[PDB]
Design an enzyme around this catalytic site. Structure first.
Site, PDB file in Angstrom:
ATOM      1  N   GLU A 127      52.586  58.369 -58.674  1.00  0.00           N
ATOM      2  CA  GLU A 127      52.536  57.071 -58.002  1.00  0.00           C
ATOM      3  C   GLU A 127      52.970  55.868 -58.802  1.00  0.00           C
ATOM      4  O   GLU A 127      53.135  54.791 -58.251  1.00  0.00           O
ATOM      5  CB  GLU A 127      51.135  56.829 -57.400  1.00  0.00           C
ATOM      6  CG  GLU A 127      50.693  58.008 -56.556  1.00  0.00           C
ATOM      7  CD  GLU A 127      49.528  57.705 -55.648  1.00  0.00           C
ATOM      8  OE1 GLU A 127      49.043  56.569 -55.646  1.00  0.00           O
ATOM      9  OE2 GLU A 127      49.100  58.584 -54.887  1.00  0.00           O
TER      10      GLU A 127
HETATM   11  C1  LIG Z   1      39.794  57.539 -63.266  1.00  0.00           C
HETATM   12  C2  LIG Z   1      39.978  58.685 -62.418  1.00  0.00           C
HETATM   13  O1  LIG Z   1      40.898  59.525 -62.680  1.00  0.00           O
HETATM   14  N1  LIG Z   1      39.146  58.810 -61.357  1.00  0.00           N
HETATM   15  C3  LIG Z   1      38.112  57.910 -60.959  1.00  0.00           C
HETATM   16  C4  LIG Z   1      38.104  57.797 -59.409  1.00  0.00           C
HETATM   17  O2  LIG Z   1      39.322  57.183 -59.011  1.00  0.00           O
HETATM   18  C5  LIG Z   1      39.762  57.709 -57.765  1.00  0.00           C
HETATM   19  C6  LIG Z   1      39.261  56.746 -56.654  1.00  0.00           C
HETATM   20  O3  LIG Z   1      39.655  55.384 -56.959  1.00  0.00           O
HETATM   21  C7  LIG Z   1      39.983  57.168 -55.342  1.00  0.00           C
HETATM   22  N2  LIG Z   1      39.694  56.183 -54.349  1.00  0.00           N
HETATM   23  C8  LIG Z   1      39.246  56.487 -53.115  1.00  0.00           C
HETATM   24  C9  LIG Z   1      39.002  55.422 -52.142  1.00  0.00           C
HETATM   25  O4  LIG Z   1      38.990  57.664 -52.814  1.00  0.00           O
HETATM   26  C10 LIG Z   1      41.551  57.274 -55.523  1.00  0.00           C
HETATM   27  O5  LIG Z   1      42.121  57.894 -54.371  1.00  0.00           O
HETATM   28  C11 LIG Z   1      43.520  57.650 -54.250  1.00  0.00           C
HETATM   29  C12 LIG Z   1      44.368  58.746 -54.901  1.00  0.00           C
HETATM   30  O6  LIG Z   1      44.509  58.498 -56.283  1.00  0.00           O
HETATM   31  C13 LIG Z   1      45.738  58.606 -54.224  1.00  0.00           C
HETATM   32  N3  LIG Z   1      46.356  59.870 -54.082  1.00  0.00           N
HETATM   33  C14 LIG Z   1      46.232  60.273 -52.792  1.00  0.00           C
HETATM   34  N4  LIG Z   1      46.633  61.419 -52.191  1.00  0.00           N
HETATM   35  C15 LIG Z   1      46.514  61.700 -50.798  1.00  0.00           C
HETATM   36  C16 LIG Z   1      47.216  62.423 -53.007  1.00  0.00           C
HETATM   37  O7  LIG Z   1      45.653  59.346 -52.002  1.00  0.00           O
HETATM   38  C17 LIG Z   1      45.409  58.170 -52.776  1.00  0.00           C
HETATM   39  C18 LIG Z   1      43.901  57.853 -52.786  1.00  0.00           C
HETATM   40  C19 LIG Z   1      43.546  56.609 -51.960  1.00  0.00           C
HETATM   41  O8  LIG Z   1      43.735  56.941 -50.603  1.00  0.00           O
HETATM   42  O9  LIG Z   1      41.889  58.112 -56.639  1.00  0.00           O
HETATM   43  C20 LIG Z   1      41.326  57.623 -57.859  1.00  0.00           C
HETATM   44  C21 LIG Z   1      41.878  58.488 -59.001  1.00  0.00           C
HETATM   45  O10 LIG Z   1      43.287  58.441 -59.016  1.00  0.00           O
HETATM   46  O11 LIG Z   1      37.070  56.897 -58.982  1.00  0.00           O
HETATM   47  C22 LIG Z   1      35.835  57.545 -59.319  1.00  0.00           C
HETATM   48  C23 LIG Z   1      34.774  56.881 -58.433  1.00  0.00           C
HETATM   49  O12 LIG Z   1      34.780  55.490 -58.649  1.00  0.00           O
HETATM   50  C24 LIG Z   1      35.624  57.453 -60.864  1.00  0.00           C
HETATM   51  O13 LIG Z   1      34.383  58.058 -61.231  1.00  0.00           O
HETATM   52  C25 LIG Z   1      36.705  58.381 -61.471  1.00  0.00           C
HETATM   53  O14 LIG Z   1      36.415  59.722 -61.060  1.00  0.00           O
END
Ligand SMILES: CC(=O)N[C@H]1[C@H](O[C@H]2[C@@H](O)[C@@H](NC(C)=O)[C@H](O[C@H]3[C@H](O)[C@H]4N=C(N(C)C)O[C@H]4[C@@H]3CO)O[C@@H]2CO)O[C@H](CO)[C@@H](O)[C@H]1O
Length: 273
Positions: A127
């Protein structure tokens, strides 16, 4: 078709085994290997599920096997919205492919992060960062299939076509499944009463790339994305009947297991997919 789900980013969403046992999903993408490239030691992040240190995440192999036994394909997803992943050169693409082969695929390593199970493939959710070398990484992973067991290649580009990061990699024709993210992008997502932008985009994707099957990727709850959530009824009555006409239609992809449980999204649409 079937439903592809992403699992890994919320410790409260259940085990991989439970997720597969729902019988609602045909593909599970494990999110995420969010740090790799540029001499970094690759690291997996599975939020509160487990800590990868000291083999704390090797327990996941139990779920991987359990899924596979039921005919579900399990991919490791690279990238995500958060992370310092990148590819610095074509050599970096090779180093990364070799690391993935030995640690998650059919190769050998003393410290496999998710244990001894052999994943079915690699999912690309690139991304930001470098727009270069993803095609090389796809080529190098694909060559490992020649050893006997197929390495599936899947991708999660954003809907605006062509994708700045994965466009070239998708042009190689090597990807089996492509679940396009039709949200968080105004020009190609659903907006109340308007399905034109999403259909028009779907038509571009399904006529432009050679991949086995293309999936409509959506957020499973309004909380799962900044924008573009589609209520189940609208999907079922207005969107699916149109997109299912394409021979390249494979199904629907959802972010994520956690939100799907809360919102009951796949429960509502399962038979229509
Ligand atoms: C730091 C890390 O790697 N992880 C974090 C975690 O981050 C998550 C969340 O911010 C997700 N947000 C939501 C609303 O679920 C976020 O989702 C993104 C994803 O990266 C993108 N890729 C897709 N796909 C369909 C493949 O969709 C989007 C979605 C949003 O729709 O992803 C990040 C990580 O990239 O946040 C947690 C909880 O706060 C934190 O503990 C840690 O685990």
């Amino acid at each position: 078709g079937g439903i592809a789900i992403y699992w890994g980013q919320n410790g409260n969403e259940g085990t991989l085994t439970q997720t597969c046992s729902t019988r609602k999903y045909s593909y599970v993408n494990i999110a995420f290997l969010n740090k790799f490239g540029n001499g970094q030691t690759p690291q997996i992040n599975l939020a509160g599920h487990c800590n990868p240190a000291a083999g704390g995440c090797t327990i996941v192999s139990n779920g991987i096997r359990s899924c596979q036994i039921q005919g579900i394909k399990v991919m490791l997803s690279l990238g995500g919205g958060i992370g310092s992943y990148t590819l610095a050169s074509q050599a970096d693409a090779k180093n990364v492919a070799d690391y993935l082969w030995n640690n998650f695929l059919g190769g050998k390593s003393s410290s496999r992060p998710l244990g001894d199970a052999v994943l079915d493939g690699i999912d690309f959710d690139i991304e930001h960062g470098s727009t270069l070398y993803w095609d090389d990484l796809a080529r190098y992973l694909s060559a490992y299939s020649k050893q006997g067991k197929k390495v599936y290649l899947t991708a999660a580009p954003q809907c605006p076509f062509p994708d700045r990061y994965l466009g070239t990699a998708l042009n190689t024709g090597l990807f089996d499944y492509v679940w396009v993210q039709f949200y968080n992008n105004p020009p190609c997502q659903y907006s109340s009463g308007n399905i034109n932008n999403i259909i028009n985009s779907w038509n571009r994707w399904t006529t432009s790339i050679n991949a086995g099957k293309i999936f409509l990727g959506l957020p499973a709850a309004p909380e799962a994305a900044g924008s573009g959530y589609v209520p189940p009824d609208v999907l079922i009555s207005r969107i699916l009947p149109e997109i299912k006409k394409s021979p390249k239609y494979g199904g629907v992809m959802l972010w994520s297991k956690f939100y799907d449980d809360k919102n009951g999204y796949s429960s509502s649409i399962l038979d229509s997919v």
